[PDB]
Amino acid sequence: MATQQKASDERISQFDHNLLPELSALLGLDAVQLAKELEEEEQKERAKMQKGYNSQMRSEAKRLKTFVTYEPYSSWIPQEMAAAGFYFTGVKSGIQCFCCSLILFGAGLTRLPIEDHKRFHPDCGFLLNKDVGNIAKYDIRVKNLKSRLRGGKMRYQEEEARLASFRNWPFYVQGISPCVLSEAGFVFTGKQDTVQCFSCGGCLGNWEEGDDPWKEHAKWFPKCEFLRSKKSSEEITQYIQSYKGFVDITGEHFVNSWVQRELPMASAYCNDSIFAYEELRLDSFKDWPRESAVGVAALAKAGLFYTGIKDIVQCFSCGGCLEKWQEGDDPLDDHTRCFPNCPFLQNMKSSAQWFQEAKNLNEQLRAAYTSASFRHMSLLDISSDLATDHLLGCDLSIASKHISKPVQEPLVLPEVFGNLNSVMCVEGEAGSGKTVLLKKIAFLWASGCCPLLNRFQLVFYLSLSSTRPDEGLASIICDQLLEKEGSVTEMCVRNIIQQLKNQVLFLLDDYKEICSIPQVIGKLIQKNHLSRTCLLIAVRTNRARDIRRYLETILEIKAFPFYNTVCILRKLFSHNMTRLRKFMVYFGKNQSLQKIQKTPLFVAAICAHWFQYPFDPSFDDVAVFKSYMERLSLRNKATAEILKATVSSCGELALKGFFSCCFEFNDDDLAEAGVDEDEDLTMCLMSKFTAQRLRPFYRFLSPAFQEFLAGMRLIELLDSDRQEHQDLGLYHLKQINSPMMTVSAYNNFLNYVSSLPSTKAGPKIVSHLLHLVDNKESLENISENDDYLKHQPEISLQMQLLRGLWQICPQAYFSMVSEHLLVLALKTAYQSNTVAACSPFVLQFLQGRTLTLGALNLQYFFDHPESLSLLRSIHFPIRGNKTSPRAHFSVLETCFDKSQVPTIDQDYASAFEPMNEWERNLAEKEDNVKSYMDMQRRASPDLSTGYWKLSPKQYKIPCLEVDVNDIDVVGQDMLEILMTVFSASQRIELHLNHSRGFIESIRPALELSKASVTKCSISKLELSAAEQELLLTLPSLESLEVSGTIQSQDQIFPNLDKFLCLKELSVDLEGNINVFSVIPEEFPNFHHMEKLLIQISAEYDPSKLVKLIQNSPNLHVFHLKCNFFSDFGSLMTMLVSCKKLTEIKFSDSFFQAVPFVASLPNFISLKILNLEGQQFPDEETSEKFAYILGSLSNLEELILPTGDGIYRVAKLIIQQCQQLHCLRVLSFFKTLNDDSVVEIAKVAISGGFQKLENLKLSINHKITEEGYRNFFQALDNMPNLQELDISRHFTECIKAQATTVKSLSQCVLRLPRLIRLNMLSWLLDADDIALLNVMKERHPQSKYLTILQKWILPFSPIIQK
Amino acid sequence: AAVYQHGCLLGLSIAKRPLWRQESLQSVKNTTEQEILKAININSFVECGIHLYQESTSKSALSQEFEAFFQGKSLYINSGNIPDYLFDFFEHLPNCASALDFIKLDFIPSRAVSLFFNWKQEFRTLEVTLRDFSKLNKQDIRYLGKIFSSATSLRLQIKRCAGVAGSLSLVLSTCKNIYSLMVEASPLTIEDERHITSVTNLKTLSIHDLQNQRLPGGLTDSLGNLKNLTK
Amino acid sequence: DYEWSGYLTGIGRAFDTGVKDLNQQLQDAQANLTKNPSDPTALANYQMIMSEYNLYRNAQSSAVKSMKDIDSSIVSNFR
Ligand SMILES: Nc1ncnc2c1ncn2[C@@H]1O[C@H](COP(=O)(O)OP(=O)(O)OP(=O)(O)O)[C@@H](O)[C@H]1O
Ligand SMILES: [Zn+2]
Ligand SMILES: [Zn+2]
Ligand SMILES: [Zn+2]
């Protein structure tokens, strides 16, 4: 009949509708482009999977089971979508229909599964209520049709007569041949799929492919004569015992039941409620207080029912509504008018003494369970009003555990109800929801619209909370279940129990011990073989040792899934979507914090908070914990000596555990904390585990909670006035001494602490946090334990970038961390209202610091604006997104090394890698990053929300650093920002990176603050005439730099007489124009320059430079790079007048060596001496130089010249380094040999080079293998060295022997701060590198130390001999 | 650590299957039962010390007591049979392993290489005996040269192996720490003999069953180079 | 009350703006090698920088995938 015709709506479901523009605000990404990328992937996946009717997924009971592997993070509940005809697929969390195709991915907050089902394919046979064989979640094979066919007594004796009835046997069941059903004595009844036994009259339905009618016949109606005549009693017995599920019941137990109800047809529009049925809505509307418009029969057809509240008529398919029931109105129009989107309405528009006593008891029990006092089970403690009937759609995660073997399997309720036999137990943590679960079961039974439970004739929900161990059953049920002490007697009840046996179910809550139980009930547990009464007992895991002896398996409650939390919040609220949306994002990124909502009681804690501040559009991540422990005081309270005592003792346990990374405790660890494991309060915080183990253990509820308790305890210690219990707080506080951890491992801890109320702790904590990152000793303390990360993947990722950031740009790392710690300290001071006592610490911290522009949005700068004057600078970068084409590989190196190629053997060949593969892999990875960064949005500065909002009067920003990089044109918003910020500073420094056209659009701002600009640094930037004229109108410039591409031949140099304040001049132009030939002769006068950094060429007798220096007594830095120069000796002589020179760099063919050495002794302030590239071809000059270096006691960076003089007299230079107690950098170039290199190690031992950080040896062409082995084995003590470079040119590769490689691996481990080792052109085999790669893991600087060995030259080496 | 008395050496001679080096090496001399039994007796004693260390979980706490005990003792390792406790001994108790005066290896399995080729320290002495080498590969030499690395002093014995001939000069070339070389019944060539007479830091040279008869610039042509030779 | 957000935001950007500097250093190193295409130190200083560039790109190319997968899992639930 063509089930559905395979839905195919052009494969463009889309789902979205441009509702994402508001989301980019939270994510930082364009959610619209992202959605488009996802749509493409979904379209591709659909084409790769099967479509068509799936008979195995026909039952919604199974569809639900397929979702046990569904991800916990979603917007939809498996029950909601299973009811809509969907089942789980194995592809990217997509779902599919059983009747139809329609492959759908993901979920939303504003759409239900059914709304989409009918939107992307409204012609679906299931949705249209065609017969597609849908089976209800709760259903059984026995139908009890109560209808006899024709005179089958004779008519259906023959197989042909029976088979002939199967003419309309539906396609949806054609997996079972009608010939088999006929042989077994079944005929077709004309119904959906039921068949009747021609003799017995019994009827079975819900047939599935693979079923065997003879086995099914044996299980139900085993007494049938036909079966008994055709099969042996042994065969029948085996068929029955070989069945699965029902234990000791048959067809007779599903019929003649006192709780039967006929149900329509499992239609699609039956979300998840009992009130989905018309019969239940109508035959429950009994307490209606005769309000106007009493057409109750018509009301029921509107999908409406009575909630039990005065006049509230609720709709099962959309929630509470129609308050005050408008009199005389029409429920169909009122429902439509109020909720013109309800699926129900959309479908509507489209379309024997004991025996009699037991019966009376049954009716009374049903009335008690369906009454509006048993329903509305105080869920989430919402109220006595505000109906919560629509909130009973969330179930618990249940697993079955064996008491003997270590076996566990997941379950769904339809598979639990069918396995109720003798004694069963439900275990869980306090607040897990086990009490609601038991009540829900009793409710379903009483309703009668839940086949599978309808075999029970009596269900008793009892609480063993105070019942004495001598009370009979009649005296208990008459107290808890019945209205009055009547109806039953003790003898009546006992007589009934022993007659019904299997049909009686007790739900026993609040179980504590076997001894403290009514004797009449205890006998149904201990000896439950003479009765076979079914008992379900709910216990906490803190017990559950008393009843395990009577069980086979246990039902355990698992963590409440995140998607149920979302649904509950979505249904109760939604009035504040901007808060719920933030909730979803928060727990999306922080993946491990989804574990906070482990117990339903925490969900209640959130709701209770969200109802107090319904219109506050912000998510406070610690609110749930503050709420949870507040509501704790309203359960069974004893504030004095109990509540305070249990929290305090538990807090001590948590605090200690959180600094040893325990999160698990034994009995001795618990005992020393003063925690009483048998107390009632210490079960709402912590759970005990006594499962099959040699010894028990304890664990706190979801670990994030432990950190919260630890935070709370720390504060109490700091605030307390008892020294004995106060200095302890400092002991624990001081365990946090690493800035790398305070931004990761302890991030949540600190956020909980700086949120809880305190009095004295505030000042005590901020004085620590602002100290940890104050000096350079703690700031550089890079350390981690990696234990706190094992269970927190989102932090492991965060720290992946921090460790990288530290290696690429240490300054970025330090600045970023410092600013973060300042914020936490200020937050703490404000939240505790202790600012008056915290400010002094902040002011001490801020001095000399650099902050970003956004740091001025902190309230502190408004309340105490004088603090602005303490800062050194404000950083204001702008980047835009200009393209920087590429690295441009394989265009230079390809014309360099050819003809000089090395000949490596077969074993060491790996030293050289091919360039083609290197480039390809890099290019691919680079593209994968670019496509993501393009989706990010920088967001212009929000200079309004407190931003130095002092309509500035008395204070100004002391220095503004403007960093312009990869931006061309600024929009109007940026012009408003630049102008606003520029006028707020006293000194503006402009750093202009490759940004062509930039100083043309910000003109309007520069023209107003011309005199405030003090620095202008120009990179690879082309200057226009109009730009240069603007620059020449900035008279305050003190520092001017041009670092390249100034080939315009413009007036920047000719007019270099306007910048009368100029002190720093830096000129380095790629195009050589012989600068100074273009500088006015009046320039070298009155300027008194402090820094001269010049690249000059082809100048002769450059008196301009000499005069400039002569008149610059404060010159600090002198860099001179040039070809043939003149009067070098004159220049060297003139520099003797510059007594404050700290840095000298001479690196080109102009240096005369001797005239330098002669003057060198006159410079005693030198910190940097760089003569790289120079030659000293003289022993006499070299020796004199070597001795002079010993007088230059302040040198930090000594970069030696090369040549024969130094080579011959290198030992003196090294030996004199024992006097230079500050050397940081040493670099040698072709100066050392086998005998002199070892002197470095000897000096380090004697006590020199103690602070050396970088040792560069590229001298290695003059040293043989022996000179390295002897060196390595002699190097013991250089506890600052970070980089060791021992490399050679590829034309002279060295093959290492086993003893050399071993010596190196030992050497590295004696250098505890080494992070970089360079070994290019060293040849190591596969076994040698395998040694170093292991040594690394024993090195203190693990996850940092990097060894560079490989060459990436663009050729293949000759790998032969 | 204070016990030196051997006790009763009668019996237990069956320990260490190669009672007489598998009835191969060692002539009519050194047949004294004590000469061999005392070494076996100590080997068992040293192994006992190792076992006590493992079953104490004292780690570094007792690094001194477990150094004094082992100092001066011997240890025999079969390259074809290396118990896992030896890895723990070398790995977790440095400065003790280096207090031993022998460490003998009987032969090239990767386990022998992985055990010795490490970054901890050199042994006072390492003794390597090759007994079963009809053929010597290039990879075998490469691995053997790593094993020889972890020693301040190497003693090498090559016995009744023919696959080593013509390649000895390619093995000794990586041994700068060799002081004693013994060769038995090996058909060595002149190139190998010239290499041997080049090792001026050699102290002990022992050659057995060399039947070349013609040594034109071979071992017996000079032998005046080994000025540091004592035996 | 001024959005006291206790979290290290912008780290992905802080890292990316670091790597981009390495790219500039690589281009500058190439220029120096180009002008002196025989200088062994110009060569060594070129491959040392280039190796670091490759190492860090291979790091963020992984971290970015992880970050992308997280974000794409969020917009798919509240579409
Ligand atoms: N399906 C649900 N939906 C929403 N809230 C639920 C649900 N099930 C349980 N709860 C919450 O669970 C709380 C009861 O928890 P639980 O059933 O574990 O009892 P308990 O607190 O351990 O004490 P006792 O076992 O004595 O009843 C109720 O306050 C209810 O708000
Ligand atoms: Zn469909
Ligand atoms: Zn029958
Ligand atoms: Zn409705």
How many residues are listed for chain A in this entry? Answer: 1361
Interface of C with A in 14-43 (CB under 8 A): 14-24, 26-27, 30-31, 33-34, 37-38, 40-41, 43
Q: How far apart are CA A718 and CA A714, in angstroms?
A: 6
The DSSP letter of residue B123 is: B
Does the beta carbon of A892 lie under 8 angstroms from any beta carbon of chain C?
A: yes
CB A852 within 8 A of CB A832: no
With CB atoms and an 8 Å threshold, state whether C57 touches A858.
no
B137 close to B161: Cβ distance less than 8 angstroms: no
- The answer, for C57 touching chain A at a CB cutoff of 8 Å, is yes
Name, in order, each residue with C-beta under 8 angstroms of A947's C-beta and a sequence gap of 6 or more: A856, A857
Residues A923 and A916 sit within 8 Å (Cβ to Cβ) = no
Number of the ligand 1 atom closest to the C-alpha atom of A564: 3
Q: How far is CA A982 from CA A640, A858, A985, A1010, A1144, in A?
A: 60, 19, 6, 10, 36
The atom of ligand 1 lying closest to the CA of A431 is 18
Nearest to B146 among A1298, A1334, A1338 (CB): A1298
Please report, as a single letter, which amino acid is at residue A30.
D
Residue B191 CA, chain-centre distance (Å), reads: 25
Please choose, from the candidates A1211, A1230, A1159, A1219, the residue with its C-alpha nearest in 3D space to the C-alpha of residue A1195.
A1219
Q: Which residue of C has its CA nearest to A1317?
A: C48
Q: What are phi and psi of A46, to 5 degrees?
A: -60, -35
DSSP class of residue A1060?
T
Pairwise CA distance, residues A1290 & C44, whole Å: 10
8 A C-beta contact, residue A507 and residue A438:
yes
Give the closest of C18, C27, C70 to A805, CB-based.
C18
B170 in contact with A, Cβ within 8 Å:
no
Residues of B in contact with A1331 (CB under 8 A): 117-119
How far apart, in whole angstroms, are the C-alpha atoms of residue C44 and residue A1320? Answer: 8
> Looking at the DSSP assignment, which residues form a beta bridge with residue B227?
none
Say what the alpha-carbon torsion angle A1324, A1325, A1328, A1329 is, to the nearest 10 degrees.
80
- In this complex, is the C-beta atom of A1323 within 8 Å of any C-beta atom belonging to chain B? no
Half-sphere exposure (Cβ direction) of A1004: Cα atoms closer than 13 Å: 11
Nearest chain B alpha carbon to A1305: B119
| Inter-chain residue contact C6 with A107, CB threshold 8 Å | no
Tokens of A788: 């706190």
Measure the CA–CA gap between A1004 and A1010, rounded to whole angstroms.
10
Strands A697-700 and A1197-1199, by their bridges, are unpaired
- Alpha-carbon distance of A362 to C20, in angstroms, equals 78
Is residue A837 helix, strand or coil? helix
Angle at A922 between CA A918 and CA A927, to 5 degrees: 155
Between the alpha carbon of residue A790 and those of residues A74, A663, A703, C70, the distances in Å are 25, 12, 13, 19
**DSSP element (H, E) containing A625:** helix A623-631
Do the strands A1322-1323 and B76-78 form a parallel or antiparallel pair, or are they unpaired? unpaired
Compute CA distances A580 → A78, A566, A570, A606, A621, whole Å. 20, 9, 8, 12, 12
Testing ligand 1's pocket by substitution, the residue of A77, A378, A380 carrying the most ligand atoms inside 8 A of its CB is: A380
Instruction: Kindly state if the Cβ of A680 falls inside 6 Å of ligand 1.
Output: no
CB-based contact (8 Å) between B98 and chain A?
no
> Which burial class, exposed, middle or buried, applies to A792 when counting CB atoms under 10 A from its CB (0-12, 13-18, 19+)?
buried
Give the Å distances, CA to CA, from A1248 to A849, A1215, A1216, A1239.
34, 9, 9, 11
Residue A478 tokens read as 């008459």
- CA–CA gap between residue A100 and residue A545 (Å, rounded): 50
Name the A residues in 61-120 with CB < 8 Å from any C CB.
73-75, 105-109, 111
Q: Which two tokens stand for residue A1353?
A: 């030259």
Work out which ligand 1 atom sits closest to the CA atom of A430. 22
Residue in A617, A627, A570 with CA at minimum distance from that of residue A596:
A627
At position B8, the amino acid (one-letter code) is C
* H, E, C per residue of A1091-1129: EEEEECCCCCCCHHHHHHHHCCCCCCEEEEECCCCCCHH
- Are B197 and B219 in contact by the 8 Å Cβ rule? The answer is yes
Amino acid at A184: A
Position A771, amino acid: H
Which tokens is A555 given? 């039902």
Per the CB < 8 A criterion, the answer to whether C40 and A1229 are in contact is no
* One-letter amino acid of A1318: N
> Measuring CA to CA, how many Å separate A42 from each of A71, A75, A560?
18, 18, 29
Nearest-10 crossing angle of helices C40-71, A793-808: 160
Q: Specify which residues A1175 forms β-bridges with.
A: A1202
Q: Is the CB of A430 under 6 A from ligand 1?
A: yes
Whether residue A1303 lies within 8 A of chain B, CB to CB, comes out as no
Please say whether the beta carbons of A415 and A65 come within 8 A: yes
Q: Which chains touch A (3 or more CB pairs under 8 A)?
A: B, C
Give the 3-state secondary structure of residue A1316: strand
The neighbouring-strand residues paired with A488 are none
Distances (CA, A) of A485 to A93, A368, A509, A1256: 55, 15, 22, 98
User: Cα(A631) to centroid of ligand 1, in Å?
Assistant: 13
Q: How far is the CA of A1185 from the centre of ligand 1 (A)?
A: 86
Antiparallel, parallel or unpaired: β B126-130 and A1168-1170: unpaired
The burial class, CB within 10 Å (0-12 / 13-18 / 19+), for A1142 is middle
